[PDB]
Amino acid sequence: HLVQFNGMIRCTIPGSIPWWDYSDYGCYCGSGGSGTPVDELDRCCQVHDNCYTQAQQLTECSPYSKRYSYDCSEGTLTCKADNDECAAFVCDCDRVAAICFAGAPYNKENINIDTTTRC
Numbered sequence: 001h002l003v004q005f006n007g008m009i010r011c012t013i014p015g016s017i018p019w020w021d022y023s024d025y026g027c028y029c030g031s032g033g034s035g036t037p038v039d040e041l042d043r044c045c046q047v048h049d050n051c052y053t054q055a056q057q058l059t060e061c062s063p064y065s066k067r068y069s070y071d072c073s074e075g076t077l078t079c080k081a082d083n084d085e086c087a088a089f090v091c092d093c094d095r096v097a098a099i100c101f102a103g104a105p106y107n108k109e110n111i112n113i114d115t116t117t118r119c
């Protein structure tokens with residue numbers, strides 16, 4: 001679930017306000033996605049969008065609402081093992097993205113861009 005994804009991003013980037021900081025970034029970070037990623041972070045979102053699309057082919061699996069079981073210790077992100085096939089897969093999509101986000105630089109210039117032309 002997007003709210004848990006937010007929780008995962010807070011785990012790797014504690015000073016982040018995820019639903020705000022990454023909801024309109026580059027060509028993929030945010031609703032929809034197209035074109036070539038603008039940077040490293042936007043690249044994380046392209047991979048994440050893809051993962052969500054794949055997690056959608058799963059029998060009634062919505063990456064958007066499916067609530068998964070994960071743990072967040074001191075930075076380390078863990079997707080609990082009891083998760084069903086969808087929750088497990090979706091929790092995976094967000095973990096990999098949360099970790100990716102934390103390793104990519106945040107370039108202010110790539111926030112809220114004119115996707116219609118740059119993507």
Ligand SMILES: [Ca+2]
Pocket residue numbers: 027028029030031032033045049
């Ligand atoms: Ca997207």
